[PDB]
């Protein structure tokens, strides 16, 4: 039916664009041990399995910001400790399977009340700040690799990568990032604007990210001489690093023996991954069986070097017979995402600057709905300009600013922990905001102030 | 007085930024025959004279878009016919003085009624479109001069001008233009926003253009290796092009004999200049006759020295905004003019201002000038569905297709004006625009009705 096709196309694009961006980011961060190919095939397989055996087909599984942050932290930890990153991921997946087969007996569903708007907004703000910082750091790295000079060695080897500075690479990359961000934001505004027929305007606005990506890809395509770093996608179903690892990762070590102490100590990183996935599932949903399936599949996906995914409820806004239609649409979207690895010529001409502009746009748009962001903005507005909201009206302005400052201190502590070599503890530390709201904030604030500032809805 | 100093500073900056951007544009168009130095000196002298002997001290005098367009058209005409541009301007100024002494004999107060919102908004839209087109054409010229190539020549002569493509000149120029436009628009939005204390927010928003110019100038100043074209200002009170012309230019000719036929035919370009100046004065004001006569006489006198003629504008005064207040306004205007004239002494500072940031300011001015135009509003309404049309008298009392027909007729007029500007008959553009006055009066009532015309074309 034509109804299924349009929704399938929309969801496929809205899942592929983040998938492509996160695959590029993962390939850059993890030295191409896990790239766009692995992320795409993992997303496809896990989406098919979740559609077939998921309680709620509305959920679509895919890589997210917190998972990328944890992958970067684990890669850095393995590099510092001289361990195999992929085998460590395999053992984390083993311990994740153990965790999911352990939680079912105890039914740890009472923790949902512990996670509140406090933790949810802190997590979302941290993720958006991480996105913005990653985009700006990539821009700085591009400008450092190819600085603005008057003389360049115009005969430089480029088979692995540019071995020296190049004239127009940095400025064109900055232009592409800025243009992608500007076009995506303008298309979003047009979707929220009052121009053009409503149906056509909404259709154009829904596809804002793919349209901006296509525009900037064409812009870079017609600039023939200038070199810009492109997305690294292998031709066919390949691991994107043949020298590094194969498809089926052998446990106990790939190039060197895996220590037993790491095998036993992989439980803690598995606990941190479970915490991250649980937090993402809670923020997307607002339930217990679907989380076990995703983490259980993530443990199996680690054996093949594939990443683990999360809940990421975005499909409900666009959407027994309805359940069957949703199941079929999700399965078709997953199949299309998997087959998107076949169009390697198309993906190999997508610059990384466009994807990082999309990353910045995603962070900026994620900042929009956060109440913590609203209060941070109110920190700069005069009190007369504060909106008519319960926390402004029923709480003193300095008390609300103190609440915002405490949340800012929490964000700063999380950022310091992430920058600290002990970045693997970033999930746990974030969950430490749960006792703070429960056992420490009531000491400073009152019940009414806490209810107004931190509310379920 | 402390209150006088702040107003002087604000008006000085709001007059200097257009002064420097128009000086750069004139230096580009006229091959530095008239540049930043001449424009600044003319602006200072005419501002002092207008403050001392002007009926309305609120009026400010400076170069504007229509004057730049006419100067470009006259330069193109002179280069096509082989005439001397700077010497032809002398006879245009002579005929301007003749025109002002003729008009004072037969006071033409009836023409003010003829110019209406129709003509004034068509004029403003054409000027904004010209600004945007000039910025984009300069960007295209920059990208053509220094294309994005894999290999450039290591050493190229740059004493007269870069003789070949350069690595990062085009992309950095585009980045500077975009950044200047973005920062200016963001500061304009911040001025009307609800952040920061109201006094601080307003004073930050008022200085949006100087702040953006300073930010982008510093950004360029910290890119040591990359080259971008910068504003050309002589060290001291010097002619922009000493080889081309001196200070006092001989009316009979500088390097070639001036034809007598051109001496007599300079009346028509003088009439076109008078039409442009009158249209600008009518747009800004709505003593006007005396002010415009004084301004045109000063411009005709300044044409003897190779300096541009100015127009009447109230942008800076309105943005800043019984006998003692008038005296304070005169003193503030005189001080602003003196500071504008002394700005040439800051040659080291002005020589580090790229042309990309100035063209970004040009684009920002062109975009901002479209805010109050009803023609722009109806052009936007052409795309919005009729449900989303606002509660405006022409929306409610006129059928939507009739309003769109009105907008289409205005669009056709704008297209005709653009075609005339593109053709070698661009010198006739001031005349053709005045031809919209009969069209509204004698042709529009044939198609529309009295109520529709009064709602669409209203005085206020
Ligand atoms: C260069 C491009 C220029 C395009 C021209 C710019 C397009 C343009 O200006 O639209 C004008 C007109 C819209 O008016 P119109 O009211 O008939 O269109 C919609 C219709 O009325 C729906 O019933 C409305 O829903 P609702 O019951 O009220 O709730 C809807 O409102 P909303 O749903 O928005 O709230 C309306 O938008 O439609 C055309 O003629 C397009 C023909 C060209 C075809 C479109 C072009 C592909
Ligand atoms: C960067 C340093 C800035 C100084 C920092 C000094 C910070 C400080 O102490 O003031 C708090 C400031 C002003 O708020 P504040 O209560 O004083 O109210 C302002 C002013 O005092 C008048 O009361 C208001 O006009 P009105 O008489 O009521 O009609 C005016 O609104 P309007 O005039 O726009 O209508 C207000 O701007 O509110 C911020 O959040 C700015 C934080 C920015 C940090
Ligand atoms: C959205 C707005 C983003 C603005 C910032 C963009 C990222 C660049 C940050 C500096 C990188 C750096 O420090 O680069 C260091 C390298 C040299 O490094 P090296 O000696 O080879 O090591 O200098 C360069 O390449 C030249 C100077 C940096 C050029 C940056 C131009 C930015 C223009 C901004 C217009 C709004
Ligand atoms: C920028 C900040 C502007 C604040 C402002 O503008 O704060 C205005 C208020 C108004 O106070 P009032 O109740 O209207 O008097 O000042 C206060 O006392 C509020 C200050 C409370 C603590 C502020 C903490 C800020 C974050 C600290 C992160 C470590
Ligand atoms: C909304 C748009 C804003 C930005 C507008 C930019 C205008 C520049 C047009 C130059 C055309 C030209 O003239 O290009 C000519 C030259 C080739 O030189 P040639 O013809 O061999 O020389 C004789 O092309 C180039 O080197 C490459 C042109 C493309 C680079 C600019 C990319 C802009 C990306 C915009 C993202 C929003
Ligand atoms: C070079 C010469 C160019 C001349 C251009 C003239 C354009 C005049 C259009 C009159 C149409 C009319 O009359 O449309 C009226 C009816 C209203 O319908 P109703 O009365 O509600 O029934 O259509 C509409 O909904 C309006 C839809 C307009 C879409 C086309 C916009 C194109 C804008 C292009 C310029 C920015
Ligand atoms: C993965 O590929 C990168 C190049 O993309 C290479 O530098 C790295 O050594 C590879 N990893 C291995 C061989 O383990
Ligand atoms: C000055 O005028 C001459 C022609 O008389 C021209 O060749 C030269 O380029 C001009 N100077 C500048 C800076 O444009």
- Domain positions in chain B are 2-149+214-353, 373-456
Ligand 4 atom 11 nearest Cα: A398
Exposure string for A360-372, b = 16+ CB within 10 A, e = fewer: bbbbbebbeebbb
* Backbone phi, psi, residue A351, to 5°: -70, 150
Residues of chain B in Cβ contact (below 8 Å) with chain A: 147-152, 154, 167-168, 171-172, 174-175, 178, 194-198, 223, 225-227, 380, 383-385, 388
Report whether B25 contacts B274 (CB < 8 A).
no
Give the 3-state secondary structure percentages of chain B, helix then strand then coil, rounded to 5: 70, 0, 30
CA end-to-end distance (rounded Å), chain B: 37
The whole-angstrom separation of Cα B190 and Cα B126 is: 28
Distance separating alpha carbons of residues B134 and A444, to the nearest angstrom: 61
| Ligand 6 site, residue B237, Cβ cutoff 6 A | no
Taking CA atoms, B314 is separated from A285, B62, B319, in Å, by 58, 10, 8
Gyration radius from chain A CA atoms: 23
Residue A230, helix vs strand vs coil: strand
Q: Say how many Å lie between the first and final Cα of chain A, rounded.
A: 37
A353 vs B contacts (CB less than 8 Å): none
Kindly state the DSSP code that residue B230 receives in the 8-state scheme: B
Identify which of B40, B53, B108 has the alpha carbon closest to the alpha carbon of residue B274. Answer: B108
Give the number of the atom of ligand 6 that is nearest the alpha carbon of residue B415.
Answer: 1
- Look at residues B180, B205, B203, B179 and name the one whose alpha carbon lies nearest to residue B192: B205
Distance from C-alpha of B273 to C-alpha of B280, rounded to nearest angstrom: 11
Structure tokens at A108: 């740890």
Total count of residues recorded for chain A: 457
Token output for A92:
């984390």
- Of B10, B81, B4, the closest CA to residue B427 belongs to B81
List CB contacts of B124: < 8 A, sequence separation 6 or more.
B283, B369, B370, B373, B375
Residue in the block written with tokens 């975005």 = A314
Return the number of other C-beta atoms located less than 10 Å from residue B230's C-beta. 18
Q: Which two tokens stand for residue B144?
A: 């053509």
Helix (H, G, I), strand (E, B) or coil at A346: helix
* Experimental method, per PDB record: cryo-EM
Pocket test for ligand 3, best of B219, B354, B356, B357 (most atoms within 8 A of CB): B219
Cα gap B149→B166, rounded to integer Å? 9
The structure tokens listed for A93 are: 């997946």
- Give the three-state DSSP class for B311: strand
Residue B152 near ligand 6, beta carbon < 6 Å: no
- Tallying the residues shown for chain B, one arrives at 460
Q: What does each C-alpha distance from B332 to A104, B51, B89, B287, B326 come to in angstroms?
A: 81, 9, 31, 20, 10
The DSSP bridge pattern shows strands B311-313 and B60-62 to be antiparallel
Residues of A in contact with B147 (CB under 8 A): 225
Cα B38 to Cα B240: distance, rounded to the nearest angstrom: 7
Classify the C-alpha dihedral B95-B101-B107-B109 as positive or negative.
Answer: positive
Helix (H, G, I), strand (E, B) or coil at B315: helix
The residue written with tokens 């169009």 in the block is A343
- Closest to A333 in 3D by CA, of A80, A5, A26: A5
Inter-chain contacts counted by CB atoms under 8 A, chains A and B: 68
Q: How far is CA B103 from CA A186, B106, B283, B363, in A?
A: 52, 5, 20, 36
Q: Which residue has the tokens 């700040």?
A: A129
Which are the contacts of A304, defined by CB distance < 8 A and separation ≥ 6? A247, A248, A249
B152 interaction partners in chain A (CB closer than 8 Å) = 152, 154, 167
SS3 A153: coil
User: What does residue B217 show for φ and ψ, rounded to 5 degrees?
Assistant: -65, -45
Task: List the structure tokens of B40.
Answer: 């600044």
Contact B384 A194 (CB under 8 A): yes
Residue with tokens 């730049």: B68
Q: How far does CA A360 lie from the centroid of its chain? A: 12
Q: How many angstroms separate the Cα of B186 from the Cα of each of B71, B191, B236?
A: 32, 9, 35
Number of neighbours of residue B458 by Cβ within 10 angstroms: 12
Q: What CA–CA distance (Å, rounded) separates B215 from A164? A: 30
Neighbouring C-beta atoms of residue B268, cutoff 10 Å: 14
Q: How far apart (Å, rounded) are the C-alpha atoms in residues A136 and A126?
A: 15
In three-state secondary structure terms, B61 is strand
**Residue B313, strand partner residues:** B60
Residues 6+ apart with CB under 8 A from A32: A232, A240, A241, A244
Atom of ligand 5 nearest to the CA of A225: 26
Largest Cα separation within chain B, whole Å, is 69
The answer to whether residues B86 and B245 touch, using CB atoms and an 8 Å cutoff, is: yes
Are B174 and B142 in contact by the 8 Å Cβ rule? The answer is yes
Taken in order A150, A155, A157, A161, the sign of the CA dihedral is positive
- State the DSSP string of B115-166: --HHHHHHHHHHHHHHHHHHHHHHHHHHHHHS---S---S----SSS--S--
DSSP classification of residue A316 = T
From the list B126, B124, B128, B117, the residue with the least C-alpha distance to B393 is: B117
Task: Name the DSSP letter for residue B343.
Answer: G
What is the helix (H) or strand (E) element at residue B313, kind and residue range?
Answer: strand B311-313
User: Angle B189-B204-B363 (CA atoms, 0-180°, nearest 5)?
Assistant: 50
How many whole angstroms separate alpha carbon B67 and alpha carbon B277?
Answer: 8
In chain A, residues with a C-beta closer than 8 Å to the C-beta of B150 are 154, 225-227
- Which residue has 């926003």 as its token pair? B193
């Amino acid at each position: 039916s034509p109804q299924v096709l349009a929704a399938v196309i929309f969801i496929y694009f809205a899942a592929l664009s983040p998938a492509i961006t996160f695959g590029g980011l993962l390939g850059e961060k993890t030295r191409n041990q896990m790239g766009v190919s692995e992320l795409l095939i993992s997303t496809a397989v896990q989406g098919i399995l979740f559609a077939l055996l998921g309680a709620q087909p509305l959920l679509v599984v895919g890589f997210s910001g917190p998972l990328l942050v944890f992958e970067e932290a684990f890669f850095s930890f393995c590099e510092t400790n001289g361990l195999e990153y992929i085998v460590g991921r395999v053992w984390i997946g083993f311990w994740l399977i153990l965790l999911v087969v352990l939680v079912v007996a105890f039914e740890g569903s009472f923790l949902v009340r512990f996670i509140s708007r406090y933790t949810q907004e802190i997590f979302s703000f941290l993720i958006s700040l991480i996105f913005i910082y990653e985009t700006f750091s990539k821009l700085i790295k591009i400008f450092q690799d190819h600085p603005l000079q008057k003389t360049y060695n115009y005969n430089v080897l480029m088979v692995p990568k540019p071995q020296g500075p190049l004239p127009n690479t940095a400025l064109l990359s900055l232009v592409l990032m800025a243009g992608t961000f500007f076009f995506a934001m303008m298309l979003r505004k047009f979707k929220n604007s009052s121009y053009f027929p409503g149906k056509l305007r909404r259709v154009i606005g829904d596809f804002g990210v793919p349209i901006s990506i296509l525009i900037m890809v064409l812009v870079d395509f017609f600039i023939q001489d200038t070199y810009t770093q492109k997305l690294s996608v292998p031709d066919g179903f390949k691991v994107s690093n043949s020298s590094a690892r194969g498809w089926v990762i052998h446990p106990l070590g790939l190039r060197s023996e895996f220590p037993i102490w790491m095998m036993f100590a992989s439980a803690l990183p598995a606990l941190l991954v479970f915490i991250l996935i649980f937090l993402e599932s809670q923020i997307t949903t607002l339930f217990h069986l679907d989380l076990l399936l995703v983490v259980g599949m993530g443990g199996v996906a680690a054996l093949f070097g594939m990443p683990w995914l999360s809940a990421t409820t975005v499909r409900s806004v666009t959407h027994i017979q309805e359940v069957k239609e949703q199941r079929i649409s999700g399965l078709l979207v997953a199949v299309l995402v998997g087959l998107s690895i076949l169009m390697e010529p198309i993906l190999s001409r997508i610059p990384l600057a466009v994807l990082f502009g999309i990353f910045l746009y995603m962070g900026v748009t994620s900042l929009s709905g956060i109440q913590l962001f609203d209060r941070i903005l109110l920190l700069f507005k005069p009190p007369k300009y504060h909106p008519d909201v319960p926390y402004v009206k029923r709480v003193k302005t300095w008390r609300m600013h103190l609440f915002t400052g405490i949340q800012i201190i929490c964000l700063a502590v999380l950022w310091v922990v992430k920058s600290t070599p002990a970045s693997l503890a970033l999930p746990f530390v974030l969950i430490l905001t749960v006792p703070l709201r429960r056992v420490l904030l009531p000491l400073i604030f009152r019940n009414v102030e806490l209810q107004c500032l931190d509310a379920d809805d």
